[PDB]
Design a protein around this nucleic acid. Structure first.
Lengths: 83, 74, 74, 98, 82, 162, 79, 71
RNA sequence: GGAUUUUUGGAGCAGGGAGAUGGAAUAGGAGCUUGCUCCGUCCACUCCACGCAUCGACCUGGUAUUGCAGUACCUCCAGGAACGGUGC
């Protein structure tokens, strides 16, 4: 019922990652909450969009509907992600 | 008045001349013949209207729920 | 399945929501929904020129919700 | 349940195309109208048709360039094709086979 | 009834698939899943106002395919029987 | 130990520090760079350091080749068909080579996409007005021997030998 | 916690005029009195009017059955 | 039946084309029912953009093909 | 197993106006070649409304920091604006 990219996104909670939306908005910061439906809630987040309007916010919440991609660090790509 | 659900309103609108406008701007005006539970429409003797001007008659026209924006009973 | 979004920490907090077509609103959330529908009481929407217009209690659906940023420290 | 809803609802307008072997037109989201006989259908409006004729209109799209030339219409024919129900926008049934 | 069982039985046939962005990919259909995941081998893809490129393998999703084109010698009457 | 297809298929390939696909071909002592068609232009960088290549030529058409490491070699001549085989070549490290004359830098002017060039630890760099001749012959290069080209150096290169 | 379905039921019971904005369409919106609703957010507006913000015009249609897939935002108006 | 179309291209470098015209070339490690691709050390071409481990959603995927041999 | 976060799609289409401005080597029609006249396709410059405002990347000059870390991005001032997207 839980996917392996969903488990990799849930296991990467608490690290400095980024989420690029379909409109180009990149919410970067520490992934505080990551649900099974790609709901990313971050604290002390930073908005760096394709528009380029870079700002800093206390809390941000991006849903999985308009989420295009997610850039995660390579600390979890070795184990236990080796299948 | 009384709160009416949209499904008996769509069931009772069969046989009456209505007009269904889509999201692309075009509308089809005709008598509603068939309306299922998936919000699909099938009309007879339909006429096409674009930008407030009539285009032509087509007859039986089937419009799905993914493209139809609104419907008004005339 | 059908898990609700984690909106318990953002309850009764002034947040700014972004809607499709480049819409921006700001208001206090008054509830949650499993379909990502948010009720914003005393909401103020930003116009194109920059003026804020108070629309009151509004309901935003999850199909057009882009990003919600909390303006208060939770 | 499903067969009665398919033979009594809007899908019966599709079912009159495959039973009586009539010609219907399908206008898609790419501004193209394909007239043909519906051979196979489904619940998701997956239309597999044979002997279809698709007509549309195209622009030169900066072909030669300097500020006076018009677009033009075009048409083509296919022996057998299959189109999904997502791109099907309008479906019109008209007595054109007679 | 179900078009997925008819599309899955069309393996080892040279067909074409036109997407919503105008890209047409012509190749031999080798794999079809329940989600219409078309896996083809030795395909040729032509995008909108671009040059055709030949690839040894290609994997197109079902939601990105707009229309399909089958040859005239395809037994559609025999393949429709479940 | 010439460069063949079996040596390229058994060589290690990974991601470099600039997030580019680089194949480590060091420690092979290849006398001539050839048989590079087995990679099928799937590498963004070529690590050919510590080799015995005499001429930087014989390479096939590779549009994805953007970086070429030819450090610690005996390269004394450059091929004239470098632009027809690598149109997207932007990084060329030719430090500690056998280039003695500036005339070997004349086939290097065909690379219009080349911006970073390294000609340090070479007898050609010890000649008079070598940097001005390299700036005049290759105006597309922006960084020469880990130094940014300024407007005064370009004016001095365009003034002399005009 | 205030549910959106309970707010829609209270707006249908109060019979107040509400304006509905369309999805990916900021030039034209609808306005009317919602009489009933369903699980798919299908609104039944009586004496509805389409307001175009660009042309500053209002065209009445009457009984309109608006689907929930197109309505993005709904606000309550005093008119 | 066999469902070996996605398992044969596992741990290999593939280039997926997006809907907006972008191309992501990365090592496909795992997938799911929603076609969620995890491309470790991926490059973005349209210019080169250093991305790394990029987890792209299946809704923005159009086509995918083999790029080269596995590292 | 087509009704809001993935697979039966909300996608399609067009780039403001003017000027006795300039070009279609081999590719427009008509006045039935060539020369001329008219009309529904671009790029370069000029004028009105450098289309507008925003932030990011970037180039010149001056200027500050000499600091042991695992990173959306990193000093400040002024000029220019080749690039990206946002709303009108």
């Amino acid at each position: 019922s839980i996917g392996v990219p969903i488990k990799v996104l849930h296991e990467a909670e608490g690290h400095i990652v980024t989420c690029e939306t379909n409109t180009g908005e990149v919410y970067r910061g520490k992934l505080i909450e990551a649900e099974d439906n790609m709901n990313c809630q971050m604290s002390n987040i930073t908005v760096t969009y394709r528009d380029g309007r870079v700002a800093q916010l206390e809390q941000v919440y991006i849903r999985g509907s308009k989420i295009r991609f997610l850039i995660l660090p390579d600390m979890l790509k070795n184990a236990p992600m080796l299948k | 008045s009384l709160p009416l659900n949209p499904k008996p309103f769509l069931n009772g609108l069969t046989g009456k001349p209505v007009m269904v406008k889509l999201k692309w701007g075009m509308e089809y005006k005709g008598y509603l013949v068939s309306v299922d539970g998936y919000m699909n429409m099938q009309l007879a003797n339909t006429e096409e209207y674009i930008d407030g001007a009539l285009s032509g008659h087509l007859g039986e026209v089937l419009i799905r729920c993914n493209n139809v924006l609104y419907i008004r009973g005339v | 399945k059908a898990h609700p979004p984690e909106l318990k920490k953002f309850m009764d907090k002034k947040l700014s929501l972004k809607l499709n077509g480049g819409r921006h609103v700001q208001g206090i959330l008054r509830g949650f929904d499993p379909f990502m529908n948010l009720v914003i009481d005393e909401c103020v929407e930003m116009a194109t020129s920059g003026q804020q217009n108070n629309i009151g209690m509004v309901v935003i659906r999850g199909n057009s919700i882009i990003m919600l940023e909390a303006l208060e420290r939770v | 349940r499903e067969e009665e809803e398919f033979n009594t609802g809007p899908l019966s307008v599709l079912t009159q195309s495959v039973k009586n072997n009539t010609q219907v037109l399908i206008n898609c989201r790419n501004n193209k109208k394909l007239l043909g006989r519906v051979k196979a259908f489904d619940r998701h409006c997956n239309m597999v048709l044979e002997n279809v004729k698709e007509m549309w209109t195209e622009v030169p799209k900066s072909g030669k360039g300097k500020k006076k030339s018009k677009p033009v219409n075009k048409d083509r024919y296919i022996s057998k094709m299959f189109l999904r129900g997502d791109s099907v926008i309008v479906v019109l049934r008209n007595p054109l086979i007679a | 009834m179900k078009l997925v069982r008819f599309l899955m039985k069309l393996s080892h046939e040279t067909v074409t698939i036109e997407l919503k962005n105008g890209t047409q990919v012509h190749g031999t259909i080798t794999g079809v899943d329940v989600s219409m995941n078309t896996h083809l081998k030795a395909v040729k893809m032509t995008l909108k106002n671009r040059e055709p490129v030949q690839l040894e393998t290609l994997s197109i999703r079902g939601n990105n395919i707009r229309y399909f084109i089958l040859p005239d010698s395809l037994p559609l009457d025999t393949l429709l029987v479940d | 130990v010439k460069l063949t297809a079996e040596l390229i298929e058994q060589a290690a390939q990974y991601t470099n520090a600039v997030r580019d696909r680089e194949l480590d071909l060091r420690g092979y002592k290849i006398p001539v760079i050839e048989n590079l068609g087995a990679t099928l232009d799937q590498f963004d960088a070529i690590d050919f350091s510590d080799n015995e290549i005499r001429k930087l030529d014989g390479f096939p058409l590779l549009r994805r080749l953007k970086t070429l490491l030819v450090n610690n070699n005996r390269i004394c001549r450059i091929g004239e068909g470098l632009d027809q085989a690598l149109p997207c070549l932007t990084e060329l490290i030719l430090t500690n080579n056998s280039l003695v004359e500036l005339g070997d830098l004349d086939p290097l002017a065909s690379l219009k996409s080349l911006t970073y060039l390294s000609i340090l630890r070479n007898p050609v760099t010890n000649k008079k007005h070598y940097r001005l001749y390299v700036i005049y012959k290759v105006p597309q290069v922006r960084v020469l021997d880990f130094q940014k080209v300024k407007l005064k150096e370009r004016q001095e290169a365009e003034k002399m030998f005009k | 916690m205030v549910q959106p379905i309970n707010l829609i039921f209270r707006y249908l019971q109060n019979r107040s005029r509400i304006q509905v904005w369309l999805y990916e369409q900021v030039n034209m919106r609808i306005e009317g009195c919602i009489i009933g609703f369903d699980e798919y957010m299908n609104l039944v507006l009586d004496d509805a009017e389409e307001i175009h913000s660009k042309t500053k015009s209002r065209k009445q249609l009457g009984r309109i059955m608006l689907k929930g897939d197109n309505i993005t935002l709904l606000q309550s108006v005093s008119n | 039946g066999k469902s070996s179309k996605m398992l044969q291209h596992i741990d290999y470098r593939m280039r997926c084309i997006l809907q907006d015209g972008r191309i992501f070339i990365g090592t496909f490690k795992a997938f799911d029912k929603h076609m969620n691709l995890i491309l470790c050390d991926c490059d973005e071409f349209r210019e080169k953009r250093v991305l790394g481990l990029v987890l792209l959603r299946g809704e923005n995927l159009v086509s995918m093909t083999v790029e080269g041999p596995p590292p």
